[PDB]
Amino acid sequence: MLGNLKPQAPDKILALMGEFRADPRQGKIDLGVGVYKDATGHTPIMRAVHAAEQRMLETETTKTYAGLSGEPEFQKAMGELILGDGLKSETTATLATVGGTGALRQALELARMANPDLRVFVSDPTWPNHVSIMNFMGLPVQTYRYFDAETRGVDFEGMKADLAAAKKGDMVLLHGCCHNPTGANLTLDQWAEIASILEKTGALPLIDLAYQGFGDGLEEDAAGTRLIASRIPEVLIAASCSKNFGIYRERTGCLLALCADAATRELAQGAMAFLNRQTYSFPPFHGAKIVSTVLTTPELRADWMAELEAVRSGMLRLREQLAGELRDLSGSDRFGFVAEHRGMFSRLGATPEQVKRIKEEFGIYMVGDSRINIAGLNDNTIPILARAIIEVGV
Amino acid sequence: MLGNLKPQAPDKILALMGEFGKIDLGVGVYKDATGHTPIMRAVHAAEQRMLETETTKTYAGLSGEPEFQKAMGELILGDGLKSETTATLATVGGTGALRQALELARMANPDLRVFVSDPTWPNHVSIMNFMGLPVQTYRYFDAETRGVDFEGMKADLAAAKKGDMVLLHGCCHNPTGANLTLDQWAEIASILEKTGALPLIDLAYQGFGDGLEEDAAGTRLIASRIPEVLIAASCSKNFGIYRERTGCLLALCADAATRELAQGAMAFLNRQTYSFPPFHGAKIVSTVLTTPELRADWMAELEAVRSGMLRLREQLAGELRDLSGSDRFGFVAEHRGMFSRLGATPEQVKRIKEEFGIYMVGDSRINIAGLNDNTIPILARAIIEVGV
């Protein structure tokens, strides 16, 4: 029977790394990586994280089945990390998930249950997984302008006109911060306007929060999510702890459902628990316990925030440097956006041909859409990247 | 929008858990003489070692780690593991493996029908209802003798068309505790082959029936007779790592080509659901399985659990016989696993819940592991004090 199965495409990423490894060039560079890499090209386990696992190993007496929708300690900690003082527990339903992706999948499942005719609006461009999941579910997908290929900034006017078309019950997917892949973000004033479009159209906002703490800071990066949560009655949030906690493989994330009233909240919480049960039953405990241990233990929370801020500042200095080199090499403003972008990714706005030229002539590898990982840069590589950009005519 | 959410029905077995002489005899978790679900020694040492060796938590394999896949396949199929034609998928618990299994099947056959045993693990029909898959049942539990109604089972299975899926429990049947013998398995293999049905084996209690290798005997028999089979495995119980959520789906194919399709579709299936599978539990399992010292101690501890329970069923059966002078409750000592269907009527079952405090599933499913020398006489007394 399994022969009638249709060939599904490879993960792609593996093929990407495949070409890189084959390259016999001594000084090749890889900015295609999608994970954080330190000065030595490694993805370190955060000190706080290693301390939490250690504590856990001494206090966990059993591994019996735990909470179906997650553990309270975790749900509360996450809700406070994201919403802060604005967390209206009475109207907030929480669901521990298998990573941010799990949260996203469940969010789409929940909304489709409440409304079969759900349509989704995604930015142009957006994380590829978004479109695939939705395509897999058979959900109708619509696009809204976002990346201005010329200024490498946000085409706000276009985004606005396109969102205006959304109607009652449609789902508008927004990245809370550090827009993957572009790196271009909305200002608090732009979020406020978007809020007005959402109130007007009656569309449900789904906020993908996977990089809180990699932009301007933990509180700063949650500003937009909070502005929306304050003005829009029903809001869906898909948080990930993969990056900001550096526990990618642990598969830790959560779906937050902000409801207009308690009755609805209980209806949402029940529906969410139902979703986990029918998919894989209980969610993975380990990562969720590393997270709640860090957030509840002052000593650990302090060292975690300290380390993350180190990461954030490191990447920022790197952006400033790259942009600086580019200013010397071109004698113009043009590449100033590199220092304006936030997150660990940035779209150079180079064409596929230019991307190919760079690889063949400079041995530098990046995603085909010219997306680069800032963390991959360094005092030695920046000079090379900068020169390449100018040389290929970007 | 969310206000249109239709209220969904809860999981009865876990419901009692919340509602809970207050003797717990429900949830299928193992418990020691002092009502505790301890962490296994080897598992604890595995975590300790992992804490020292792991230097990164970056994204890993989408279909699970190669070490985990190999070890698991060998644990289940032993020397019948033909990796060239076997695809493996690391999942979120055995439940995730079942779901993924149903998704893959339907993907390869939109007009798929699933046969389940009467009765079976409630979660089975639950998930299938959600997915909208046609569920049919085959006779299994012989209400009177508490054994298997084999003649009824064979008759119903023979009615399966090809392209249909048959859900069989590899061992330790939940909720009955009634299991097929190897000879009966060969019979089932005959039917499956003639009907062209795909067997989906739910293997959640390997090591709780008669032993690690013995409990897999049935699964291995089918793996050798049928060219294409799916096996949904769970590490929750036999490794005691319930909350880590770890198991795997094994897809056995007739050729390498089909195998590549399945593997591809399995990985794609993980990617669209939650991306990468949980690492921690998978790692504990592989570390244990590949570390001779660790596997040795794990087996020993699992043998202790298995023997202790058999010892308990024997004590209970004895008291039941010496409390009525009849071989009626003999089925108790015959059943395998941590469950056993007493065959008690719902009135009686619900009755004993309050004045007594003994919580057992509404269908008279009792977790033998909850019993103990102190509780046994009280339970036996209760059974006689009530109706049956």
Ligand SMILES: *Cc1c(COP(=O)(O)O)cnc(C)c1O
């Ligand atoms: C990284 C990322 C995620 C995280 O996925 P996980 O399942 O947590 O690993 C989710 N959304 C976006 C846009 C991301 O960039």
Ligand SMILES: *Cc1c(COP(=O)(O)O)cnc(C)c1O
């Ligand atoms: C325990 C069990 C499973 C799997 O449980 P997971 O917690 O998802 O590993 C599947 N089927 C049966 C019959 C079980 O008892």
Ligand SMILES: O=C(O)CCc1c[nH]c2ccccc12
């Ligand atoms: O009691 C059992 O059947 C095993 C534990 C159990 C109860 N409900 C469940 C739902 C999903 C996964 C495991 C379980």
